[PDB]
Amino acid sequence: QVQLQQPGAELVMPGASVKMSCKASGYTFTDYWMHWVKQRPGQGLEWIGAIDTSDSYTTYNRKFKGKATLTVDESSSTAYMQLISLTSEDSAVYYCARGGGGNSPFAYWGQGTLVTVSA
């Protein structure tokens, strides 16, 4: 009934960075948070940021500050991820979670995308 979908890979060269789609179904999208998790092939889990659905309020990491940009749409009940100036260093599998009032949990996850960049 409830799941998350983020299919595709979308490999890209530097000079521009691809923007994620995260779509949710099975629950009211306006009443729940949206999170993001980055899985690096070097077994890094490093967390990206969280965005509120109602407001545009976001939270970003120190090392990821100024890079990641979060935006959501309540009309399509989806979530978007906007990066800038990706280089050959950044590669990973992107995830998007939900949360909620209690526990703000990770319980539901996506399939994941394969991002491989090269010069």
Place this chain on the structure above:
Amino acid sequence: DIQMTQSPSSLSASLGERVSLTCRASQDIGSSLNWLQQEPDGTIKRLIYATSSLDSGVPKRFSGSRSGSDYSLTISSLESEDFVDYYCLQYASFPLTFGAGTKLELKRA
């Protein structure tokens, strides 16, 4: 950022032989913690949240306990599909951080 120390980073065990993984935090996060199972195919699934509380649909073999300075994840009986990457996370305060992790191995010749 508040760092989550997960040890040991690796272990080798056979079917059975219950083993608990202990995480330590430099600050007090309260009763708020989450455990995540990471499958080799790339799909992450939650297991244990808020200490004694567990997920509906996950078998009872997964359990947890707290000595009050530490957070422990106890598995009663292991299996062949129980080899994954376990991580302890603190959702009590931003930013959310991830632990070191442990890769379960099987004793062979």
Place this chain on the structure above:
Amino acid sequence: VLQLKLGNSAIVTQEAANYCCAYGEWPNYLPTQPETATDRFYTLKSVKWETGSTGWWWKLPDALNNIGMFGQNVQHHYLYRSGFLIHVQCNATKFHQGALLVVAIPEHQRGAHNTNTSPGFDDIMKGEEGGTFNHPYVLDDGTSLACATIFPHQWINLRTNNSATIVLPWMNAAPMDFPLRHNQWTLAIIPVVPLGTRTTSSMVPITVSIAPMCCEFNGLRH
């Protein structure tokens, strides 16, 4: 019309009389002083206030972390106790309508909507940039805006007075405090009544000035 001259600078302001003293007291000295070094009003960046503006908040001394001469003494010394004189002047014509509530919230604990996760360091201390109200009706701390008038406040109405002057003494449990850690006061501008105009969208600028008057410093280092 009346210019308020403090230090080597000054700003043209409305006639200042019977200014609001927070909790009926003024920032006296603790029973060197920066009446020269760091004195003059520090004008922050003018925010664009539109019809859909929820509000803005500047913690003290969060917006002052690095500002002019005062930005040096923040990380320079060990402790301080400082008063604040806040003058918020909003310039507009007689054809604009609206209301702005300038209130000082002592010891403001922020919060988040529909989650138990506590905000991080970058979310609390934003520096000079300042934040924006997520839900100004609940003040973001969980309380109600209707009873929020218990604090010191002044009313800016485009009819009567377009400016406001609030004086904040030193409010703390300790005689001195840490510059980069604890925020004693909070400055918040709450647009209870939104903007309205003949045109679909307009822009009303807001000027904010803060004077760290009658303060001290201890623990000289660096």
Place this chain on the structure above:
Amino acid sequence: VLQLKLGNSAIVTQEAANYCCAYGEWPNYLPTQPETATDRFYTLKSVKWETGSTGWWWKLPDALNNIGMFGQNVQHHYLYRSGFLIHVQCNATKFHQGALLVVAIPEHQRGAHNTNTSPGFDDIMKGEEGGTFNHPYVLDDGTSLACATIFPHQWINLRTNNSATIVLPWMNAAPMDFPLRHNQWTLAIIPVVPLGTRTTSSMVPITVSIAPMCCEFNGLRH
């Protein structure tokens, strides 16, 4: 700005000084009194004044026949003598132009156009609703409006003063009069200069207040 407080109520008004006393006298007592019972200003229904508005008239006490507390004593007692303080305040912006002549006509005999038939009871006494000038140039009595200034009057100009205050003492041949029969005074607002505006049609409201100050009553019955 100055509020005029009479009785248990009051109305925000312009500064009241050197008010017009009709024929240079004030309504003194005849050589119980309603300084409490029937005292406060009774505000009539606000009339919509447009470009093609000829005018309006309220006879005294025709509009007061049944109003608030005063409506009880009209049919209750046998005779009375009452003064009147009339304050007509017309609120408008600085972009509206026009002129309003507020004049009190003592002993006003109305008339009809091009007929010898005398008006009936419903045509003379209209109660609170009030009438409308058929031909305000001739005042409807056959006289001329040019020389109509001989009565007590004040000028309401959207430039100088937007309000007017006229005090009418007791004018009668007899010391007392009949409530439902004879009308001593008449209140008339004459728009000598019509309305004009950028838009084709606008609406300018007019507020009228009448205070039966310093009166008496006799012949208690019912």
Place this chain on the structure above:
Amino acid sequence: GNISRYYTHWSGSLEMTFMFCGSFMAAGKLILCYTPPGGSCPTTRETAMLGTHIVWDFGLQSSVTLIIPWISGSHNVGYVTCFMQTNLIVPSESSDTCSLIGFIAAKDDFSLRLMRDSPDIG
């Protein structure tokens, strides 16, 4: 209100302050009336006039001072009626919609007693 919910018996005189947040050129007048306990709530206008009332103008006074005489309650009495005296006159450049903000405070005779628990858990 929030402090009185910790108590039961409350007796004292209240006060109401109204502020007009619209533009400077807004014309027109209003009416401000109070209803005594069991006071035959006004149908249109004149019924409200039989009690304490004041005519308030947008141009002259920008604020309202209203003293209400010593209500009472413990464990339909009062009311406040507001109507349109005349039309709202605003220029072409100003917006058509204005608003108001009501205020309430307590006088020096307001008294409280008999502490209890707040009915609102959250």
Place this chain on the structure above:
Amino acid sequence: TVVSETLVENFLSRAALVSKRSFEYKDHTKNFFKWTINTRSFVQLRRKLELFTYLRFDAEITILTTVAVNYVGLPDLTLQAMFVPTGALTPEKQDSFHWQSGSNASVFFKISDPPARITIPFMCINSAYSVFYDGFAGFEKNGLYGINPADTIGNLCVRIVNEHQPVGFTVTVRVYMKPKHIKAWAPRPPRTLPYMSIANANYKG
């Protein structure tokens, strides 16, 4: 229909239960509890104290002990209530000496007797307690938000003096706290929205 009691001293001072715990005791062939005695747990006293910013008061702790039955009869146990002030590290090697150290204040009371009543003085570095603290814990630069290390009263530690008694009875302990000499500053707006967590001010709505 139709200022003495309105004072702050009478308003904030009332007897309420800030801790409720019952340990299961049947056969052990341990038994103890410690808690930080904070006002953020009990929901009615929390919002009661959320009205004010800084508070100065002396906590008055009273321990009420009741024994239930899971006819034998109720024996009289001897209980020890020890207060551990802030700054005392707790390396618990139970069955040996920390509890009995003469530094910490302890009190002995039986089951049948007037309830043990002690008055904790005002222990702070600053002038008064901080209910609303804007900042972070200590200087860690990212240190915990919403918790001030400057104000911690301590932990209330209670155990039974006697050894294991062969009964299946469960001991219920109730701790009431009535503050005295209350001084208030900077009143704030009440919080209508429910409490999601006691660690911070987050709201749901």
